Symmetry: D2
Subunit: 92 residues, 4 copies
């Protein structure tokens, strides 16, 4: 997978030799180009996935929030009906 | 009747009381008592039904709190699920 | 409390003009005790129910407040999740 | 690692030169060495913040769960109180 630090350092070390064969130089540069493009791509795939994850969590917690509003509304109806029952008994 | 009920009982104490005036006094206690027992039974029936309805309506709010728990627990499990999903890659 | 049929027997007993004064006074005292106690039971029943309805309102209002506190904690997680997305945009 | 893929490509194209002076070849590889170490640390901190964010959100939502259970039990006791009131009204009869 992605080049580890020590494995990445070995490539940079052999690229330091000016008399390195061109076939080996292009091969090492290709490894850096493929590894850097794959690592950048993986970084953007996690940034996008986390942003969508945080957005999905906000929508799911909001449905629990709205359910708390239903609890307050129904409980307040029992309060209103209890006061209505009190006024109803004093009318008679 | 509040105070006139004692006036009717005081008038019926007279053994001289005319039978027409005695029957009218006893019938006044007859209609008033039947009206009072009905209002009492209507009261004990109304408050028993009122408290039963309040239990049902407050229970509706209890269930909404349960639904809120279930929605929020789903967000907790989903958040934990998208945590192990990030470590898989 | 005196039942409607049992109350009718006392009224029919008082209808008798030949009834002795000892039983007539005792039958009227039977109606005076029954009525004053019946009115007292009715008023005390109304007073107790009004205190019950007022107490239930207070107890449910406190349950509403806990629902509000639960709502504000859940909304805080939404607000914190939103700033977590903005703080990951520090690129 | 703020090096965009086009900036990284120019360094690779520079290292392709066989006649490249040793000082320029050493400097170019030093840029990649520092940039790669800064990009791995940024990747590790990202995976660290993502796990800590999802853990803190679970904790805050669980705090909201415990209060919903508390509000549930408060209202359930009001139901029992309402039932105990109806039982006490019937006892006095």
């Amino acid at each position: 997978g992605p080049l580890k630090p020590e494995e990445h350092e070995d490539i940079l070390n052999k690229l330091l030799d000016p008399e390195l064969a061109q076939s080996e130089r292009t091969e090492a540069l290709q490894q850096l180009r493929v590894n850097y493009g794959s690592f950048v791509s993986e970084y953007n795939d996690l940034t996008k996935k986390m942003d969508a994850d945080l957005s999905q969590l906000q929508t799911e917690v909001e449905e629990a929030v709205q359910e708390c509003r239903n609890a307050e509304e129904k409980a307040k109806k029992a309060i209103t009906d209890a006061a209505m029952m009190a006024e109803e008994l004093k009318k008679e």
